[PDB]
Structure formats: C-alpha cells, structure tokens
Amino acid sequence: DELYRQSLEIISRYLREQATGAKDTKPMGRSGATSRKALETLRRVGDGVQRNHETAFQGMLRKLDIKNEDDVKSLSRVMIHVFSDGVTNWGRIVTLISFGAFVAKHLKTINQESCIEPLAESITDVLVRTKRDWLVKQRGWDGFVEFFHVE
Ligand SMILES: Cc1cc(OCCCc2c3n(c4c(-c5c(C)nn(C)c5C)c(Cl)ccc24)[C@H](C)CN(c2cn(C)c4ccc(C(=O)O)cc24)C3=O)cc(C)c1Cl
C-alpha cells in the first residue's frame, strides 16, 4: 500500500521535526519530490493551524492524559470518532496532522519521544482507512500540494 507508505513518511517526518526542532536532511522514498513539497507545505500550514487552535488543542491534550506507550496506543479510537463522519476536506486532514504534531511536542516534553513513531503510525492508519476513496479522488499528496500552493 503505497498511499500508506507515502502518508506515513510525510506524517512521521513532520511530527519528528516538530518534536525535536530539527529538519531531516535525508531524501524521501518514492514519490519523494511530492513528499518533500508536502512536508514543506505542512511546515507552513500546520504551524498556522497549531497557533490558531491552541486552546482546543490544549484542552484535548489535557483530557487525553498521555504519559506512556499504552496511552498512545489507546488514542486511535478517539481519533476515529473525531475524524470519521461528516464533511471531508484538506483543512480537516491538516487539523488531524497538526494535532499530531502538538501531541508529538508534548511527548518530547515528557521524555516519551519513543512514542512518536507509533503515534505517526496511528495517525496514518486512521487517515488512510477512513479517507482512502476521497484521497484518491483528490489525487493524494499531489492534490494536497496543489491545494495549498502559493507561488
Ligand atoms: C493525533 C490526533 C489527531 C486527532 O484529530 C481528529 C480529527 C481532527 C480534529 C477535528 N477537530 C479537532 C479538535 C477540536 C477543535 C479544533 N475544536 N474542538 C472542540 C475540538 C475537539 C482538536 Cl483539539 C484536535 C483535533 C481535531 C474539530 C472537532 C473539528 N473537526 C471536524 C469535524 N467535522 C465534521 C469537520 C468538517 C469540516 C472541518 C474543517 O476544518 O473545515 C473540520 C471538522 C475535526 O475533524 C484527534 C486525536 C484525539 C489525536 Cl491523538
């Protein structure tokens, strides 16, 4: 499943970057040109989203009470409930990933950086299992890049 693979590369990289503050110099895998542009887009847009929703993001994180690996393992069901139904658009997908970044920075703050990859995996799984058809119709990460493109 290539969509999964590409989504996970992008989301994992953005969350790690956000948590550690360091950009990764390594190239991407296949569809790497699009993935690189999608990561650059996430930088701009997702930092904006995290700033705009800081209060709701805080309250959610607080009620989630994330302290270790099993706490992280239990977040998929909340993620699905909040993300599954209703309107789908690129903004909501960016909100999913942006809150992922917010949680990743928390996880680094509490010395639980080892949970960031499973978090990424959980996010990607929920993204692809719930929005597959939609993402394919919108041309995947290419469509994401073009949607948020600023010349
Ligand atoms: C890693 C990870 C990712 C997650 O992410 C789940 C989906 C993304 C998401 C949405 N939310 C969110 C709020 C949030 C905000 C902001 N306020 N409150 C009161 C809350 C709870 C917050 Cl704090 C954090 C994420 C939100 C609101 C309800 C709007 N939401 C939408 C639902 N429906 C039908 C939509 C139709 C269009 C659009 C749009 O953007 O035009 C958005 C939505 C969303 O999916 C969840 C969890 C547990 C985790 Cl661990």
Swiss-Prot record:
A motif (BH1) lies at residues 81-101. One of its GO terms (cellular component) is nucleoplasm. It is found in: Membrane; Cytoplasm; Mitochondrion; Nucleus, Nucleoplasm. The keyword Cytoplasm applies. Keywords: Apoptosis, Cytoplasm, Developmental protein, Differentiation, Isopeptide bond, Membrane, Mitochondrion, Nucleus, Phosphoprotein, Transmembrane, Transmembrane helix, Ubl conjugation. It comes from the Eukaryota. Its main location: membrane. GO terms for biological process: cell fate determination; cellular homeostasis; DNA damage response; extrinsic apoptotic signaling pathway in absence of ligand; intrinsic apoptotic signaling pathway in response to DNA damage; mitochondrial fusion; negative regulation of anoikis; negative regulation of apoptotic process. A motif (BH3) lies at residues 38-52. Cleaved by CASP3 during apoptosis. A motif (BH2) lies at residues 133-148. There is a cross-link at K23, K26 (Glycyl lysine isopeptide (Lys-Gly) (interchain with G-Cter in ubiquitin)). Induction: Expression increases early during phorbol ester-induced differentiation along the monocyte/macrophage pathway in myeloid leukemia cell line ML-1. Rapidly up-regulated by CSF2 in ML-1 cells. Up-regulated by heat shock-induced differentiation. Expression increases early during retinoic acid-induced differentiation. Changing K63R: No effect on ubiquitination. Changing K23R: Reduced ubiquitination. GO terms for molecular function: BH3 domain binding; channel activity; protein heterodimerization activity; protein transmembrane transporter activity. Interacts with HIF3A (via C-terminus domain). Interacts with BAD, BOK, BIK and BMF. Interacts with PMAIP1. Interacts with BBC3. Isoform 1 interacts with BAX, BAK1 and TPT1. Heterodimer of isoform 1 and isoform 2. Homodimers of isoform 1 or isoform 2 are not detected. Isoform 2 does not interact with pro-apoptotic BCL2-related proteins. Interacts with RTL10/BOP. Interacts with BCL2L11; may sequester BCL2L11 to prevent its pro-apoptotic activity. Interacts with GIMAP5 and HSPA8/HSC70; the interaction between HSPA8 and MCL1 is impaired in the absence of GIMAP5. Involved in the regulation of apoptosis versus cell survival, and in the maintenance of viability but not of proliferation. Mediates its effects by interactions with a number of other regulators of apoptosis. Isoform 1 inhibits apoptosis. Isoform 2 promotes apoptosis. Belongs to the Bcl-2 family. This is Induced myeloid leukemia cell differentiation protein Mcl-1. The chain holds residues 172 to 322 of 350 of the full protein.
